[model samples]
Target: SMKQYVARLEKDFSLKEEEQRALTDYKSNDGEYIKKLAFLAYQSDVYQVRMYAVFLFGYLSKDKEILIFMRDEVSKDNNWRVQEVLAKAFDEFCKKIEYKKALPIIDEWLKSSNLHTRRAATEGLRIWTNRPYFKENPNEAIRRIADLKEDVSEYVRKSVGNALRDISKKFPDLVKIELKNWKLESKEINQVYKLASKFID
Candidate 1:
């Protein structure tokens, strides 16, 4: 039963390594198992079940189809816990690809109307840029984050600020220049710039 399965998972609040292996093995054996998990993730009222489904998606596939399904069907979920899972799943998905491969897709996500979707893009792509390729060549990273410097949502603004801070550690001048070009007039933009520039001299 779905309830029974969720009960087992809640005892730990996350899957054990072996438990994850079992689910992965099942997905490998049954072509339809991943779909079943995805349905439960989006349909179930239980948080544990939904979280497990998110974990399953990360474990099972990194295809663009799965990414699009996550972006459209799950990214705007109101549950912060569910969105947390989506955030982690985003990082996991991008970890499997080249930065170039992930960039255009992330660009689309930034253009989404849903604040959650936009935050997910910024958060996920932040981790993606923390890797070697983007750290060395950060122009695209700065440009992507700049697109949302004036975002109205506090949540998205926080993500954007934090992402820039992450980049600032490795590339302070880039962050400083970007913040300058934003022409910060609003309190929120100033606040974001302050946090991103915290470590700057």
Candidate 2:
């Protein structure tokens, strides 16, 4: 299907038609497509190339570059949909072992004024803490999520709860700790507790 679909892009991908086809034609393997797309993103001025690279990074590679792309580029997207791409990239990056590189970036995002960026940061940190590297850092991870409990936006607050839910999976004991110690008000805390219970139960 991609082969046929890509053929129709000959004119739109005109500058890189041959390469775009070579990258998008196959569904079985994505290694070639990723490398080619990364190069095209680096070479092209079009934002779509970079967006495509972000898509492939999420769909294909779980490398450190995806983290860097989210920190440096995804936060800059004018379109909320484009910024949402970082959620998948963050999800992919979180599946790997932590090398300690992404933690600071995640921390910095928690301080952001942008609600979307803050939400993405929590989602990324949610995945980051499950990496084996974070086994030593549960308290710090929980503290970070707790700090986000009262964000001005409800969606961000929900993301904070979701992050806690995922992180609690790696350290099940933290759920009780969160149940007892997380400082959000009673009503909101109960709501978030219900949210966290879905995955933990």
Candidate 3:
């Protein structure tokens, strides 16, 4: 089932780096196996695999404060590609915890002071209605994403726009009303509006 999810992730970005299958393969095994794999990834001769190390540590560790630390350090991290890794890591975190149960953590990151943290929250959860609890109630996804339309960072707002577009296909009316409420006075906000309104017409 989630194997298809791996396929979708490929469409989002090139998986040939370490290979997309490697990610799902890591995800399929036990926590210990993946953790060991991450350890190995950290030890790789390559530099980017080291980027893989940071997020998996945050995922496997139970310490909540680690994310607070991670949220800041990841922003400070210079590698832009690694930022998507941060998003995948957050997705894995929520999937393990169950998206519904992970709402508190979701909102926490979505409302964070750091741009990377906020972007992770939106990017990792795209096609929000594709997940369980959200399928029946896309309104929840709409509102949360709508909150980010005005984000100062175009980086974060871009993900917000994409997430809204992803959800809009499934629930146009819900997205429609919410999009109606946005004043769209600023280019940043209207940028999201244009993407979100794609399916509205």
In terms of lDDT, which candidate is strongest?
3
Better of 1 and 3 by lDDT: 3
Residues 133-179 of candidate 1: C-alpha lDDT, one tens digit per residue: 68677878877886787888989889888888888888888877877
Off by over 4 Å in 3: 1-47, 58-61
Error of 1 at 170 (Å): 1.3
- Pick out the ten consecutive residues of candidate 3 with the lowest summed lDDT: 1-10
Task: Give per-residue CA lDDT, model 2, range 1-201, as digits (tens).
Answer: 443333334336535333243346324466655555454553344444444555555544445565555656566666554456566556555554343665666677788777776887776555647655566787777777778776777777788788778777777777666667655466666566666656554
Clashes of each: 0, 0, 0
Off by over 4 Å in 1: 1-31, 60-63
Question: Rank by lDDT, descending?
Answer: 3, 1, 2
TM-score result, candidate 3: 0.77
Query: lDDT for model 2, on a 0 to 1 scale?
Result: 0.60
**What lDDT tens digits, residue by residue, belong to model 3 across residues 2-31?**
434334434443324443545555567786
Candidate 3's clash total is 0
> What lDDT does candidate 3 reach at residue 196?
75
**lDDT accuracy of residue 63 in candidate 1:** 57
Candidate that beats the other on lDDT, 2 or 3, i.e. the better one: 3
